Design a protein around this ligand. Structure first.
Ligand SMILES: Cc1ncc(COP(=O)(O)O)c(C=O)c1O
Ligand SMILES: *Cc1c(COP(=O)(O)O)cnc(C)c1O
Lengths: 419, 417
């Protein structure tokens, strides 16, 4: 009934009134480790110690070495399934590696580009599976690269749709991906999805897969995902230069104090370093030795990620319990229960996402902007909301999610009622 | 006139004897010696359990593009720049210069008519010579045309500079090392700075790339007073003209230090808007390391005096060896820098490329002839850069003495022809 809707809306008004009265100051936008997680690697603050030399004898305190410490690259070679000469180590930002590679592609073109992308006078286009990473889209938006949203399925993106786009459009030069524990879909690419993406024919000869494996070992269970050899499949398929692989220890060690990694064919490595050499003499070797001494080996990082999991998994479980209690009866919402990564993706009643965050903002609860997971912040259904549960304490988290549920219910009946 | 031929023979035997000694030395590495890096070995155990900066910031976590205020304050004093006008980045000041050029080409400066890549009249930079090869590699790779400018004693030819910038709108910038130049060793005078920030430009978005890389890198016990290039520019109505750069790569660890960028509040906001598309923020833990290590600006000055104790004898050694073997024949000239990391040696014209070839054939690595010029084009084929910071004093004297043997042989060789 329209009248029983009006009755429920009133109950939601009192709950919002009561929630507003609690005058809170919570935040669900911070995709950063908690202080408890960062304590796990406090040994780094005293590393490397007096021994400033890596196992090869190189003085990490002095200029030199573009590829990075081989000992550290060997640890993540195993974790990612990439050969050491196909993997380099940079500074504190993997996003900076992605941005530089896009900027190099526009200014100088890829290793096999017909011309720099800026010289294509009609334009450049990237494919962006949604919901996706906002900072992925900020790179292409700032660089004038147009972005084409792609639906996300269970085992990866819509490969049928991608294969038709890249076949007809030479302007499509790349695609943003998070192939493991997607931000924020939580979706991990299947072996078949990987196989077809590196095999599909592209109108652009220099099409690139931006393989941001940012959560490669960031499990929320006791199981670690088997990495698909995207570089090996691409080489066997005749497209060795297609994948650009990225990873980072920002959510393994310190967020912003870790090490970044880039992986690709030997030509792509040489191509990137030729232009990165005009920018920097080389990366920070001392921090790379800090992580080498701290980790020890690849089995060490795996154990380190299980201590992160012990801190993180109860928080993801709490968000699922609160949303299930407040919202399952309403049948207005759906949300992921991810096996890894740092984000839960919540879908509320269409046309209420922007309203839900506005209502939450004015009771002291900061929520990720509606549409952040989409290029140009354009969620066509006005329903998606990203939830970042890693940082706040369990009690702060319990109240933020419970408050967010109250606003989502109020915004729901408000939309059904007045329209 | 054949007394030349008599001397050439003596030079041939000295080269023959030099070659027979089968050396393997290097005067190319512009790096601190291991002894210099040892002064900063306390950094290898810093910051310690207290991961928080004086403001309470957890440096281990995401956030903050400006950098730690405590460290920015230390170098605010050392450079003569207000703290809000200065930011701290990662381990490379060269990467700040590259990004700012790339931002200027793709997006244009804070007050540019259009991105530089959209200029059909091309983009041009003025490059005082002898200069920094990595400065020129940026503009060379970016397709920016480079204009060599002669260096005088108090700075570059400002009269020539003011003529070019006044008539050519395509001239958008200029590469400078304002104190202890790489490799001229020249420090810009107050008058030269005042004119460069006051000269009027055909390009409304002209930029002084003020790479103050050797700002506190003295080879005496006195420190150079920094010119307030930003204040003079602001009072002259060109607040956005200077981009200031500095580094701790020659202060602490080469490649493990902190970089700095300075400018007007608009240029800081302009840079950070596009640097935010590139990175969530710089390494705050390493900036906390240097803050704990330095303590204050007076600590950095003391640290630079420890570097001077190691560096000054090496520059004095190179001067003594070149004066001994070369001054009598009057073919060569070289700088005696009061600071910086490089000595600039000029031999006879048409001799540099031959001198480095002769030196490479005796196991002595000399920096490529012309490397201090855009496109490596030394029109007189005479300049040779000497980097005396890294090798041992014995290794240094042998390489420099061997260098003089080759320069004299290539001199006599050319005189005949
Ligand atoms: C998918 C993805 N890529 C990149 C990043 C940024 O990582 P980094 O610290 O290496 O720049 C994030 C962090 O949230 C992310 O979720
Ligand atoms: C050595 C030097 C630098 C050092 O820059 P980093 O990227 O921090 O290593 C910068 N400018 C000049 C002119 C130099 O000689």
């Amino acid at each position: 009934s329209p009248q029983e809707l009006a009755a429920l809306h009133a109950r939601h008004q009192q709950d919002y009134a009561a929630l507003q009265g609690m005058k809170l100051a919570l935040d669900l936008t911070r995709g950063k480790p908690s202080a408890e997680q960062l304590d796990l690697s406090n040994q780094l603050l005293s590393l490397p110690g007096d021994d400033y030399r890596d196992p090869e004898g190189t003085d990490t305190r002095n200029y030199g070495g573009q590829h990075g410490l081989p000992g550290l690259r060997a640890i993540f070679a195993e974790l990612l399934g990439i050969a050491v000469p196909n993997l380099i180590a940079g500074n504190n930002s993997s996003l900076e590696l992605m941005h530089d590679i896009v900027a190099f592609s526009m200014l100088y073109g890829g290793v096999d580009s017909p011309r720099p992308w800026i010289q294509e006078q009609d334009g450049i286009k990237f494919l962006c599976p949604v919901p996706g990473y906002d900072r992925h889209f900020a790179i292409t938006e700032t660089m004038g690269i147009e972005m084409i949203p792609i639906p996300m399925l269970q085992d990866g993106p819509d490969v049928d749709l991608i294969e038709e786009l890249v076949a007809v459009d030479p302007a499509i030069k790349g695609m943003w991906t998070v192939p493991v524990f997607g931000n924020p879909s939580g979706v991990t690419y299947s072996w078949e999805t990987v196989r077809r993406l590196v095999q599909m024919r592209t109108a652009a000869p220099d099409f690139r897969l931006f393989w941001d494996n940012a959560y490669a070992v960031h499990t929320l269970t006791l199981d670690f995902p088997r990495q698909v050899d995207v570089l090996g499949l691409a080489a066997k398929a005749g497209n060795p230069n297609r994948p650009y692989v990225f990873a980072s220890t920002s959510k393994i060690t310190f967020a912003g104090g870790g090490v970044s990694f880039f992986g690709g064919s030997l030509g792509n490595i040489a191509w990137y370093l030729q232009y990165a050499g005009k920018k920097s003499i080389g990366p920070d070797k001392v921090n790379q030795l800090r992580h080498l001494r701290f980790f020890g080996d690849a089995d060490g990082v795996r154990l380190h990620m299980l201590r992160h999991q012990q801190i993180l998994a109860p928080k993801f479980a709490l968000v699922a319990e609160v949303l299930d209690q407040r919202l399952s009866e309403s049948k207005i919402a759906s949300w992921t229960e991810p096996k890894g990564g740092y984000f839960i993706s919540l879908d509320v009643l269409p046309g209420t996402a922007r309203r839900t965050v506005a209502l939450a903002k004015d009771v002291g609860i900061a929520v990720t902007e509606a549409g952040a997971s989409f290029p140009y912040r354009k969620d066509p259904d006005d329903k998606n909301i990203r939830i970042a549960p890693s940082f706040p304490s369990v009690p702060d988290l319990r109240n933020a999610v419970d408050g967010l549920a109250t606003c989502a219910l109020l915004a729901a009946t408000e939309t059904l009622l007045n329209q």
